[PDB]
């Protein structure tokens, strides 16, 4: 979900 999207975006 969105938390996962933020993790990948900030990688």
């Amino acid at each position, epitope marked *: *979900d*969105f*938390k996962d*999207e*933020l*993790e990948e*975006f*900030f990688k």
Partner: antibody
Amino acid sequence: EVQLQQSGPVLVKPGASVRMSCKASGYTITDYYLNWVKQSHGKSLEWLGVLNPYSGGSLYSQTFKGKATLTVDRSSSTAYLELNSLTSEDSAVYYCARQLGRGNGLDYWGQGTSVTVSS
Amino acid sequence: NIMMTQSPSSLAVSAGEKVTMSCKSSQSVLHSSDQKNYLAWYQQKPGQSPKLLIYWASTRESGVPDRFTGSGSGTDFTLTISSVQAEDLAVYFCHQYLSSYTFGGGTKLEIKR
């Protein structure tokens, strides 16, 4: 010193689009992510999304996906927010605010751009 | 989304008093990979942009006076101002950034004199 200089206030009609700018100085724009946050009144903040100025990619709140578009011009150290299909519920102050990384707070905020949507 | 609720909506104190204000999240803001609560506090003085006070729920940002302290865990967070100064009047916001970013509705700190 660090600065985020946003463009000035605007009046736009319902249905139109608007683009506003956020110019970083005093630091290297690609070293920080850049968030955009709406303030409709003094007791309300709402996140739009975040830009990676290095890559140019963006992650949008579901609320604003397809409504907001984030871009960057690295050569002039300037980020942009474009908003489409404007309504009177879109009148607000829009802030750009930098964020070092995932776990950080929004450590420096621009002075905001006031957008009024009105006939 | 994670909903943030602040209380009280406003309060008024004389300079030198201690104030506490509450921020509650509708679910955990605990970030698992570093075991940090992704919870930030901001101060917005009249006519100014917000300023970051606290992140990770309890870490003070550089330059923030010692009198501002963030605490809490789980879903219940607190900002304490140990000895309020006249220049502290502001709206104080909390912010979670674990998931799609959301903010509380603010506590407005007024000064009595």
